[PDB]
Design a protein around this ligand. Structure first.
Ligand code: 12R
Length: 557
C-alpha cells in the first residue's frame, strides 16, 4: 500500500530555475544576508520523492465510523449546483498551465470555441468512462525560504480540460460542504481577525484550557484509497444533479484515488496512490479527512470538551486540561489513534497553556493596543519566511506576490506595517506602479489586486484599528528584532525614518495614493491624523474572500 511507485525518470523543470537569491539595486535596502535566502528547484525533487514514499496501514474503529456517520448526516443537508462550462472557465487563473491539447488559460477565459469544444469532450468522457486513470503532470514547486535546505515540494495536476470539468462538478460542493459538515471548526470561513476571535472565545470557554497543534508528517502521502473513497461518499450525500453524481464518481475513480505521473518531458515517472496536491478537492478533501481522523482520535484519547480548528492538514485542538502529566499522556494516546488512522506525526504534539504560544497555520495570537489604549488581540507570525520571499520579490517578478498576500493577511502586525508596506510602497512609487493590478493568493485562491486599494481592503478585513495599533508585546517585538538581525534587515528605527519619506511621497501624489499615505503610514508621524472610515471601502466586493480553501485548486476570482 505504497503512496507512490517510481520508474527512475526524473521530475524535470519547464523553464530555467534559480536557487540563489537574485540581487538588484534595491536588495541591500531590505536584506544584507543574501546567502540565507534560497529557492527550491527540481534539483532536490529526488530527495522529496524519498520522503513522500512509504507504506500506509490503516486500522478503522468504531470512533472513526461514528464520526463519519455524523459528518454524512450534516452533508446530506447540502444542495450543490453544476456550474456551466462558461462559469467554470471564468474561475480559471489567466496564467494557469496550458492544455496539452492546443489551447491555454486565456483561450478558456475568453470562451474560445476550441477550448469549450475540448472541455465538452472531456466532460462527455467523464460521464461515459468511470475506470481509465487520468494522466497527471508532476512538477517541483519553486518556493523561497530562509536556511535553518528543504527539498522542493511536488505538485501533481491533471490537464487544463480536466481542471475545468472538476470546477463544473465540484466547485459549489468544495465551497459549501465543509462549513456545513464542520461548522465553526472549518478554518477557511474566517478572515484573520475572525480566526483570532474564534480562538480567543474558544480558549475562554474552557475552565482550565489546554491547546495543541498536530502536525501530520507529509499529510498528502498519508491519504489512502479508503480516505479518498470516504471523501467521495461524503460528497455523494449532497443533493446533486445526476450528471454531477456521475462526474464525481468518475473523477474519484480516475483521478482522485490515483494515476500515472508524467514529467514535463512526457516521460512516465511512476504512479500515485495518495492525495494529488494540484486538484480542486485537495483543500476540502484534506480538511474533511483531517477533521474526521482528529475528531475520532479525540474520542479515543477521551479528551474533554474538544474544539477543533482545521485548515487542510493544519490542525489545532483546544480542550479541558487534566493537569500537565495527564495532558501529556492523553496526547500520546491521541497520536497513537492518529497513527492507526494513517496520520502519523511529524513533530510530536505539545500541550500549551498560553494561547499566544500555540502556532497553527504558521501563526499565533498576540496583543497590542488600539488608539484608545484598549487591549486588542490580532494574528501574527514569525516574519522570517515573509521577509525571505519579499527579498526575492524585490529583484524578480513572480506569478504570486507573497508580499501583497502578507500585507493583506497580516496588516495589523508590526513587521507588515513597518517593513513590507514601507519597502514595497517605496518601489511602486519609484516605478509609478501603484495602479497596476498584482496577483496574490488568499487561502489558495488567486486575486488581482491594485496596491492603491489596500487601505479600503485592510479597513474591511481588520477594521480601522489596524492603522492605529501600538504597544506591541515584548515577545513580539523581540521576535521581529531577532529576525531582522538574523537576515541582516535594517532595524525598525530605519524603517520608521524611511516610512515618513514614503508617506510624504504618497501624500504628494494626491487621490488614492494620498489615502495610502494617510492610513497606511499614520504610525510614522508624531502628530497622528484622525482616521475615519473610507467611503470607497463599503463599495468593495469581498464576498468570496473567506468562504473556502482552494490550495492547489486552480481558482481565480
Ligand atoms: C490566517 C490563516 C492562515 C494564514 N496563512 N498565511 C498566509 N500568508 C500569506 N498569504 C496568505 N494567503 N492566504 C493565507 C496566507 C494567514 C491567516
Amino acid at each position: 500500500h505504497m503512496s507512490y511507485t517510481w520508474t527512475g525518470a526524473l521530475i524535470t523543470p519547464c523553464a530555467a530555475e534559480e536557487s540563489k537569491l537574485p540581487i538588484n539595486a534595491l536588495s541591500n535596502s531590505l536584506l544584507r544576508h543574501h546567502n540565507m535566502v534560497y529557492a527550491t528547484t527540481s534539483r532536490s525533487a529526488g530527495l522529496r520523492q524519498k520522503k513522500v514514499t512509504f507504506d500506509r496501514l490503516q486500522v478503522l474503529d468504531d470512533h472513526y465510523r461514528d464520526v463519519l456517520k455524523e459528518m454524512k448526516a450534516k452533508a446530506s443537508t447540502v444542495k450543490a449546483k453544476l456550474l456551466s462550462v462558461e462559469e467554470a472557465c471564468k474561475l480559471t487563473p489567466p496564467h494557469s498551465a496550458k492544455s496539452k491539447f492546443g489551447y491555454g488559460a486565456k483561450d478558456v477565459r475568453n470562451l474560445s470555441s476550441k477550448a469549450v469544444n475540448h472541455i465538452h469532450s472531456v466532460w462527455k468522457d467523464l460521464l461515459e468512462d468511470t475506470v481509465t486513470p487520468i494522466d497527471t503532470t508532476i512538477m517541483a514547486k519553486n518556493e523561497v525560504f530562509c536556511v535553518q535546505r528543504k527539498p522542493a515540494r511536488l505538485i501533481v495536476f491533471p490537464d487544463l480540460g480536466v481542471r475545468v470539468c472538476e470546477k463544473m462538478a465540484l466547485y459549489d460542493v468544495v465551497s459549501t460542504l465543509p462549513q456545513v459538515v464542520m461548522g465553526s471548526s472549518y478554518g477557511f470561513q474566517y478572515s484573520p481577525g475572525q480566526r483570532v476571535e474564534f480562538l480567543v472565545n474558544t480558549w475562554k470557554s474552557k475552565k482550565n484550557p489546554m491547546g495543541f497543534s498536530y502536525d501530520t508528517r507529509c499529510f498528502d502521502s498519508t491519504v489512502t484509497e479508503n480516505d479518498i473513497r470516504v471523501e467521495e461518499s461524503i460528497y455523494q450525500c449532497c443533493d446533486l444533479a445526476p450528471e454531477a453524481r456521475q462526474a464525481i464518481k468518475s473523477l474519484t475513480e480516475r483521478l482522485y484515488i490515483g494515476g500515472p505521473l508524467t514529467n514535463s518531458k512526457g516521460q512516465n515517472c511512476g504512479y500515485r496512490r495518495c492525495r494529488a496536491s494540484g486538484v480542486l478537492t485537495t483543500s476540502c478533501g484534506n480538511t474533511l479527512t483531517c477533521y474526521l481522523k482528529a475528531s475520532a482520535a479525540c474520542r479515543a484519547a477521551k479528551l474533554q470538551d474538544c474544539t477543533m480548528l482545521v485548515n487542510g492538514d493544519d490542525l489545532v485542538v483546544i480542550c479541558e486540561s487534566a493537569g500537565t502529566q495527564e495532558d501529556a499522556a492523553s496526547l500520546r494516546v491521541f497520536t497513537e489513534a492518529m497513527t492507526r488512522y494513517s496520520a502519523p506525526p511529524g513533530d510530536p504534539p505539545q500541550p500549551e497553556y498560553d494561547l499566544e504560544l500555540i502556532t497553527s497555520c504558521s501563526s499565533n495570537v498576540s496583543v497590542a493596543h488600539d488608539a484608545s489604549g484598549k487591549r486588542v488581540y490580532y494574528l501574527t507570525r514569525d516574519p522570517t519566511t515573509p521577509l525571505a520571499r519579499a527579498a526575492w520579490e524585490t529583484a524578480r517578478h513572480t506569478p504570486v506576490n507573497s508580499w501583497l498576500g502578507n500585507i493583506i493577511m497580516y496588516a495589523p502586525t508590526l513587521w507588515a506595517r513597518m517593513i513590507l508596506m514601507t519597502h514595497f510602497f517605496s518601489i511602486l512609487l519609484a516605478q509609478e506602479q501603484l495602479e497596476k493590478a498584482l496577483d496574490c493568493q488568499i487561502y489558495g485562491a488567486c486575486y488581482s489586486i491594485e496596491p492603491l486599494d489596500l487601505p479600503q481592503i485592510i479597513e474591511r478585513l481588520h477594521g480601522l484599528s489596524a492603522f492605529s495599533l501600538h504597544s506591541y508585546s515584548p515577545g513580539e517585538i523581540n521576535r521581529v528584532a531577532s529576525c531582522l538581525r538574523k537576515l541582516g534587515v535594517p532595524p525598525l528605527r530605519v524603517w520608521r525614518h524611511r516610512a515618513r519619506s514614503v508617506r510624504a511621497r504618497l501624500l504628494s501624489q494626491g487621490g488614492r495614493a494620498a489615502t495610502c499615505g494617510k492610513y497606511l503610514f499614520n504610525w510614522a508621524v508624531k502628530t497622528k491624523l484622525k482616521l475615519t472610515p473610507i467611503p470607497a471601502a463599503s463599495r468593495l466586493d469581498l464576498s468570496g474572500w473567506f468562504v473556502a480553501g482552494y490550495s492547489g485548486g486552480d481558482i481565480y476570482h
